[PDB]
Amino acid sequence: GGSKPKVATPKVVEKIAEYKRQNPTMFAWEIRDRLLAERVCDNDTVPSVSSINRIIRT
Amino acid sequence: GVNQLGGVFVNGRPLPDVVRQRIVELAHQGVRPCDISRQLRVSHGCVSKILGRYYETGSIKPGVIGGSKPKVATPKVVEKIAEYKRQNPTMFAWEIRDRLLAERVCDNDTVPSVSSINRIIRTK
């Protein structure tokens, strides 16, 4: 046993994929921007740029 | 990967020490950085970084990669845990967790987990 997600929630992970659907030319910081504007994540629940790129790699 | 100069590189990893040494050696010999970059197939930005750091530090070593800074194991929280143990060596981790709160050294968000408290006890 290791650990469970705190930011890479199934919902956030699905939206990121959806943002990559609209326009793959997005930068990590931009995904964080919309993921924050569409109120999909709280300023305290929003994945860090590193996590977003980790999510994308996974 | 292969950079645009045709050089093999490992994204995210430091240039091998042997290459780093050759960059400094060639500049020492009078080779222009742009020529060092083209001949060794390393971005001129990297050559620039390596040389700049060498003239400034004397070392060819890359910086220390990785790690993170403490989040709950704050310098004050750590000292408090030490003070609690010194006061009552038999006090349990969860009881320590409770006194940290009862004295307000931490919030319900700042308070270290039981694992962390024991880990803190064990390490520093």
Partner: protein, 102 residues
Amino acid sequence: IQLWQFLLELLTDKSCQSFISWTGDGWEFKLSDPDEVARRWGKRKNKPKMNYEKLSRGLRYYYDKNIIHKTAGKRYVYRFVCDLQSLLGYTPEELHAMLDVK
């Protein structure tokens, strides 16, 4: 994305032909409107201050990487010298046909 790739993207899109197009000679291309091309590059990379001057320096940077060469005697005319055939899987005449290149 890299500059040379970005230009290729524009060159394989019919709606961009009024500002950048193949000259028909192999992999040679022309920046019919160099300023529109620079603006779009600036937008793609999030670089508000991009302009032709800097785009041009970017192209000069490709000269010794044997990625792109500049055609002499003309302005705004360059040529991909890397092997696009292998990358795209198309031949010059072949790609021009897919894009209705005069």
